[PDB]
Design a protein around this ligand. Sequence first.
Ligand code: HEM
Length: 179
Amino acid sequence: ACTKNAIAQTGFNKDKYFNGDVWYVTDYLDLEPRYCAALAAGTASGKLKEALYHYDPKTQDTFYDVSELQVESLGKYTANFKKVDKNGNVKVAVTAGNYYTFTVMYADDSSALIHTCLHKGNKDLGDLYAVLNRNKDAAAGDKVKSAVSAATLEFSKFISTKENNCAYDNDSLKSLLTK
Ligand code: HEM
């Protein structure tokens, strides 16, 4: 179960974050504990959208999702996901109870700290924090690391994805934003 009400960045710039480009997860902190993950965030016909990519570099399990984000407040969203193939073909339709919340705690032009809480069927899932970068496997800079500290989190507890043999289809993620 999730336990955190993450606070969104003061002065969060939604147009800059939801600009259609890709964000790579470089480090993550699962509160209820080795996938690679990335997302594109953008707008399509005035709707906030995210496309997600998960890849397990050991098992090869790979899945994509597309979501419309509903606004709770600035920087805090609720997203109903549909599982799709890389082309946007629907594999699992949207259903109530399958959603995640998404809070942007810090963002700038190259980096971000987010919180997400996943709800899926009758599964019991926990909070996840992620450090994001515009560049694949980029080392976390001082701004986002300071934001981790300011959120009262210990960055040394995060797990890096940078040393995983991961590959990302950024072209598919960007194209999925319209799906
Ligand atoms: C490296 C960081 C992450 C790891 C290790 C990770 C891990 C996982 C795992 C293991 C599952 C399978 C859950 C299950 O069905 O048992 C999953 C599903 C999911 N995750 Fe993540 N995740 C990460 C980042 C994210 C982020 C940042 C988001 C949202 C922005 C997200 C959203 C989702 C969604 C929506 C599903 C369900 C997709 C579906 O069933 O169609 N994940 N993740």
